């Protein structure tokens, strides 16, 4: 019952950096062991982002262990090591090089244009699944990966909550967390609603699930990095795409799962996300509106959004390839 | 501007005439080296050790630095500040009288030890409590009380959120999320408990400042300990403080009645009303987070050590408020 703890995951990685990280996470690890891990992780990430495919896979696997393991005794040092990797990653991402902050209208127009161009709804897999055309085995592929996107999303939102120093903005994220964790009934948290769906269609919903899909690991690593960033524009961009923009996927999948014979109660997970209300109309939009005049915020937000879309598209492409093969 | 940044780390550090304050500032630079950060950690640990071994100047200095590290609001330096804070926590926790139980107490014996400890640390009889409940406080003296209540209340929700982040079990994170929702005003952020308290302060002539910086040593000691406990990797420390703050406290009813008898309206004193509650601690839902962990002696030792330390720093804080209250009007 430690499958998603850091040391068992590191022991299963046949790489020298896994042993160095393990030593840095020991109870009496020295400052030098931790700095050594940080340096070798930063160099590994740099070599991988420069084109060494093996170093790339290796640093993504290690970053997955560092940022998303559940043994809280090592979390602070794990997050410290993860930041050494984030710093390299953010130097390599194409940055919104704006010199002057866009107008609020121009900023919104840029957002809508980028979303309309890179939205998950146009992917051939979205169309196929919404159509009702997935077989039971294909819906199992889809939902197995949905589990990984959903089951710990509330934790990433909580990291953003922690970094919103304004009490009213923390309150906005607290209202989100409250809804996401079931309001007064933890049985209806959105991870447990999805779990109920998975069990209804023959899958296990494992809260210690560990992903083996590279594109899924890359997606979760990026999402956790963005939501944890000290410049909250990164997290607000991802919050925006994950929760604020008109979801639309949830309603069409709900109809399709009921078409597939699941009951209304079993498919509740997709029902609860449906929402008519434009993104700027929502109250959480004020967290973004207030920061638009700041060009540093704009650059963080727009860079975050583009990177999120890149990793999300590669992830959806990989789910789709798996679905076509069953 | 200087006012807008007065609870940021670097402005606070530049006002601390401590050698180690410059070393911390260098460690917080955007491109600070691992050597600079390691040096700052070492110097802070040595300062904390010297203070806790009896050097009163080192004790005051390390506590001021820990206040800046753990509770400043410039998020850009927060991760390194918390990294440095832990070097201090490790020293602090070696010096705290800690429960050396060899095996776990029974549920009954655990509840009994908790209740006797809480009973024996009640402040219902404290001279300041009696002075305020009795009516006897002048307006200026009520202001002293509420000025410090502000520091206790206004960022409590953040400490609870650090505990939420460390509850890996989804149902337990949900329990803390329900607390946070209530604490941040449910659907109306104007009704968050800090803003209810701001309304009470405004009613009595005081400003409620969300960039407030404490200058009372016992108050700093209290906030430092509370943030340490809620952020601890062993959640027994946070559950101890959470339970004494939320599941047991049984205080707010008499302050509410005293304020109403002093001419404040129900709406002005709402901050105290919302806290009043009939239901025993075991009856509450959050108690399950504690009930599940009793069998684990490591949890019991963290929890009981945390409870005792919390009471020591809270009692010294309440004494210091009382001394200040008696210096006015
Ligand atoms: Fe949700
Ligand atoms: Fe409260």
Author numbering:
A (entry chain A): 2 to 327
B (entry chain B): -1 to 247, 249 to 328
Can you list sentences taken from the study reporting this PDB entry?
Iron anomalous difference maps extracted from our native data revealed that in all cases each monomer contains a single iron situated in the middle of the three core helices (α1, α2, α3), which are surrounded by four auxiliary helices. In the FlcD·Fe structure, Fe is coordinated by three residues that are part of the conserved iron-binding motif in other HDOs—E181 (α1), H191 (α1), and H274 (α3)—and three water molecules to form an octahedral geometry. This coordination is reminiscent of the 2-His-1-Glu/Asp facial triad in non-heme iron α-ketoglutarate (α-KG)-dependent enzymes but exhibits meridional geometry. E244 is located on α2 and aligns with the fourth residue of the metal-binding motif of other HDOs and, instead of coordinating a second iron, is within hydrogen-bonding distance to two of the iron-coordinating water molecules. V278 and R281, which replace the terminal two residues of the conserved metal-binding motif in other HDOs, are part of a loop that disrupts the α3 helix. A second iron is absent and the α2 helix is unfolded near the active site. A flexible α3 helix was also reported for UndA, BesC, and SznF;11,12,16,24 however, assembly of the metallocofactor is sufficient for folding of the α3 helix in SznF,24 whereas α3 folding in FlcD requires binding of both mononuclear iron and substrate.
FlcD, an HDO from the opportunistic pathogen Pseudomonas aeruginosa, catalyzes the excision of an oxime carbon in the biosynthesis of the copper-containing antibiotic fluopsin C. We show that FlcD is a dioxygenase that catalyzes a four-electron oxidation. FlcD is a homodimer in each structure. Each monomer contains two domains: an N-terminal superhelical linker domain (IPR037061) and a C-terminal iron-binding domain (IPR016084). In contrast to quintessential HDOs, our data indicate that FlcD employs a mononuclear iron cofactor to catalyze a four-electron oxidation.
